[PDB]
Amino acid sequence: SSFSFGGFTFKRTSGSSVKKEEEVLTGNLQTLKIRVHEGYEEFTMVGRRATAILRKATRRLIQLIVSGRDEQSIAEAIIVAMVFSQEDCMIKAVRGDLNFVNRANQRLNPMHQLLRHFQKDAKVLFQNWGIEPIDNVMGMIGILPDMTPSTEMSLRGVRVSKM
Numbered sequence: 001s002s003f004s005f006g007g008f009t010f011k012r013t014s015g016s017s018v019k020k021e022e023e024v025l026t027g028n029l030q031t032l033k034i035r036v037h038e039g040y041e042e043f044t045m046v047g048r049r050a051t052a053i054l055r056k057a058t059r060r061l062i063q064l065i066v067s068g069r070d071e072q073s074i075a076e077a078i079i080v081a082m083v084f085s086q087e088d089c090m091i092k093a094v095r096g097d098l099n100f101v102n103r104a105n106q107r108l109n110p111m112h113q114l115l116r117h118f119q120k121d122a123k124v125l126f127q128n129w130g131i132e133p134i135d136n137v138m139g140m141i142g143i144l145p146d147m148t149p150s151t152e153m154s155l156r157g158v159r160v161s162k163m
């Protein structure tokens, strides 16, 4: 029930899943083979600089409530969770080819190639994830694709909590 991904320790608190290999198409129509976890699961994500509560279904991020030291660490947690969710809109935000041949990419599986890609630049990821109107849940705030806080709109499923 415990593992690490992208610098975060994930702790499953509810649900379960089975694993299966699956092919997915990027925004540049490149086929990647990823190990998909099938099932509804809830997690706590614990990093050095941020933590979050994550609820996910098969290839769908349902909710992510993230707190952390500042915008850079909160954004990094959001990126890791978006990649971890394996959502189609994250796969489709890859607009160029993923380099799997360079000697330094020879051991990254596709999940880690995706993570590195969006760690270098997440602008397309955030712009294509989608936004939604939000309500007045005190203690929490919305975050826009450009990472500025908002009390009216937020990246779909994502809220920022005070630390």
Ligand SMILES: CN1CN([C@@H]2O[C@H](COP(=O)(O)OP(=O)(O)OP(=O)(O)O)[C@@H](O)[C@H]2O)c2nc(N)[nH]c(=O)c21
Residues within 6 Å of the ligand: 003, 004, 005, 012, 017, 034, 035, 037, 041, 084, 085, 086, 109, 111, 112
């Ligand atoms: C998306 N993931 C990824 N993951 C876990 O996160 C860790 C790293 O993921 P990964 O590198 O894609 O998979 P891993 O099995 O290590 O490697 P590979 O795909 O090369 O066979 C593993 O312990 C994996 O089981 C997950 N664990 C659970 N429970 N649910 C999930 O949705 C996921």
